[PDB]
């Protein structure tokens, strides 16, 4: 299959409660492999999977610099707490070749700046991000980012996948069943369950007489079980007597072929 390595970094200011917290978590697909938390104090970066502290420590300081600068760019007071988030990493195909790289930032939950897919240019969301853009253009930051994403990222993803091949390259199919719950004399809920799957990407749909029921289906967010696997369900309300007109459809990478399920 295709795979991704991604770091998700959060920096959050807290005036009057010390310097901003910095946390960086690294994933291969839906598997965490590292955490660095400036508030831990426990041994610096913690492995999170069985398969450079200094860069993480310096990244803490850089993110605090960023937060200072952003407060200024938005004319904000020193009293409020603000959030800077970063995502970066690479996507590779089944042959290990680069599909694309990522390096983007959000401030207070809004997109701020992103490295374009070319790995050479920036997209800035507003006049504040244009300041960052100019600074980064002047210092040739995109060239450094491109070198990391095309080189280090892809190389280390390939090495991790090989070391961790029994887990990272194993897709676990969903276990599936349909439940039935009357709501009244006139109607009942059918709920299609998918349990125990990895990775998290899945498609679960209901059809009625072969027509998609997108508007009428309640689909819960895919959720972690805590054992590496994920869970999801999709529900529809159906007239009593008409249950056999409804089919649940499941697509997942660990399935030899897609499932069609009905009640009983």
């Amino acid at each position: 299959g295709s795979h991704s390595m991604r770091y998700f970094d959060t920096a959050m200011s807290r005036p009057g409660r010390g310097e901003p917290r910095f946390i960086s978590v690294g994933y291969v697909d839906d598997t965490q492999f590292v955490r660095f938390d400036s508030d831990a104090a426990s041994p610096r970066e913690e492995p999170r999977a069985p398969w450079n502290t200094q860069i993480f420590k310096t990244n803490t300081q850089t993110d605090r610099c960023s937060l200072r600068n952003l407060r200024g760019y938005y004319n904000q007071s020193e009293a409020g707490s603000h959030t800077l988030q970063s995502m970066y990493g690479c996507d590779v195909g089944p042959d290990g070749r680069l599909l694309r790289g990522h390096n983007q930032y959000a401030y207070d939950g809004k997109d701020y700046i992103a490295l374009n897919e070319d790995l050479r240019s920036w997209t800035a969301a507003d006049t504040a991000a244009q300041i960052t853009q100019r600074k980064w253009e002047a210092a040739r930051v995109a060239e450094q980012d491109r070198a990391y994403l095309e080189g280090t990222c892809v190389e280390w993803l390939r090495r991790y996948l090989e070391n961790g091949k029994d887990t990272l390259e194993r897709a676990d199919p969903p276990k599936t069943h349909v439940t039935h719950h009357p709501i009244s004399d006139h109607e009942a809920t059918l709920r299609c369950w998918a349990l125990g799957f990895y990775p998290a990407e899945i498609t679960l749909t209901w059809q009625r007489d072969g027509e998609d029921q997108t508007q009428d289906t309640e689909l819960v967010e895919t959720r972690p079980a805590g054992d590496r696997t994920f869970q999801k369900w999709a529900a529809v309300v159906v007239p009593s007597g008409e249950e056999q007109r409804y089919t649940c459809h499941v697509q997942h990478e660990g399935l030899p072929k897609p499932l069609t399920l009905r009640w009983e």
Binding site: T62, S86, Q144
Partner: peptide
Amino acid sequence: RAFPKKKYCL
């Protein structure tokens, strides 16, 4: 064995 990226100040 983690290799994070050097960040740059916004």
